[PDB]
Design a protein around this ligand. Structure first.
Ligand code: HEM
Ligand code: HEM
Ligand code: NI
Ligand code: NI
Ligand SMILES: [O]
Ligand SMILES: [O]
Lengths: 153, 153
């Protein structure tokens, strides 16, 4: 994964992109299409463009550039925030508390038991299946950080 | 992973949890401790507590239950939001646009060059090292979604 400061580096340069997301988007796609022409053939609405000049002139190529960098920006900002929130918890449970993944499984089953007992109206079979998958994904994230830190959990 | 409706089911039952986080946190730790006595040994503050009635009387156990469900809740809500943002992107690039992972490596290459070219003051060796790793994490997330969908590309 990235460190705390590694994400801050990423978000700082991303702010600069957002000051002219249109121009950045355009240049990224044109650099892609010139360096790797086979990428242009995946785009039914752009593959007619032959020259740099035609590409720079395309209103919709510039609009698509914005759509791509906006979506990627949103994803990176969520990853940064999510990592900063998870890594402290993973570190303390790995190093200080030394909690095996097995014990995270037990507390996952305890949550599902309590939600079945107290909220069956918003916890039918489907919603229970959903929570079981959700808590497994959470354990998997922790297990991934445990490995990064070389704690056998 | 979870479908759109499954994440909504998770968020919907979590809303009920957060409405009585005190009581739910207590019931989760009592269920864990009574089902798996070994887990009580990890808790210096609680390991003397011998019965549900003792555990229910512990103000410390209640406060810890709140800290646990508060931390978990934040992680689940972020995961639901990020997945609902990522899953459609991966779905469309796999099944509609048919974009191999190697082409996301190409566009990552172009994003690095455009950032180095236009914002070098904000894009030194470390900043560029950070962005390179961050774009890898993005491609790995799409790659993990493609594998789920049995798209090789
Ligand atoms: C950082 C990488 C990428 C991001 C964030 C991104 C994002 C997007 C978004 C948000 C859309 C519109 C919604 C959708 O159809 O899912 C889209 C459409 C599309 N993307 Fe991507 N994309 C990326 C990489 C690529 C690459 C490398 C290719 C092809 C070589 C590609 C080909 C397409 C195509 C063909 C469309 C459909 C465009 C249309 O509506 O005519 N994408 N992309
Ligand atoms: C959903 C699972 C879990 C969550 C979200 C969680 C969260 C937390 C948080 C936020 C803290 C306080 C800050 C910290 O030290 O990181 C904490 C402390 C702790 N956790 Fe966990 N925890 C989980 C599972 C477990 C399990 C299963 C055990 C043991 C079986 C455990 C043992 C501890 C201990 C011993 C502490 C320190 C308690 C204290 O000194 O007051 N945790 N946990
Ligand atoms: Ni978002
Ligand atoms: Ni948060
Ligand atoms: O794209
Ligand atoms: O915990």
């Amino acid at each position: 994964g990235l460190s705390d400061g590694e994400w801050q580096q990423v978000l700082n340069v991303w702010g600069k992109v957002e000051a002219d997301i249109a121009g950045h988007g355009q240049e990224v796609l044109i650099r892609l299409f010139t360096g790797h022409p086979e990428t242009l053939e995946k785009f039914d609405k752009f593959k007619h463009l032959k020259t740099e000049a035609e590409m720079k002139a395309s209103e919709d190529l510039k609009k698509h550039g914005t759509v791509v960098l906006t979506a990627l920006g949103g994803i990176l900002k969520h990853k940064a925030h999510a990592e900063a929130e998870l890594k402290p918890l993973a570190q303390s449970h790995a190093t200080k508390h030394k909690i095996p993944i097995k014990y995270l499984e037990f507390i996952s089953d305890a949550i599902i038991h309590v939600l079945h007992s107290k909220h069956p109206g918003d916890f039918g079979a489907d919603a229970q299946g959903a929570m079981t998958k959700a808590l497994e994904l959470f354990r998997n994230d922790i297990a991934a950080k445990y490995k990064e830190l070389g704690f056998q959990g």
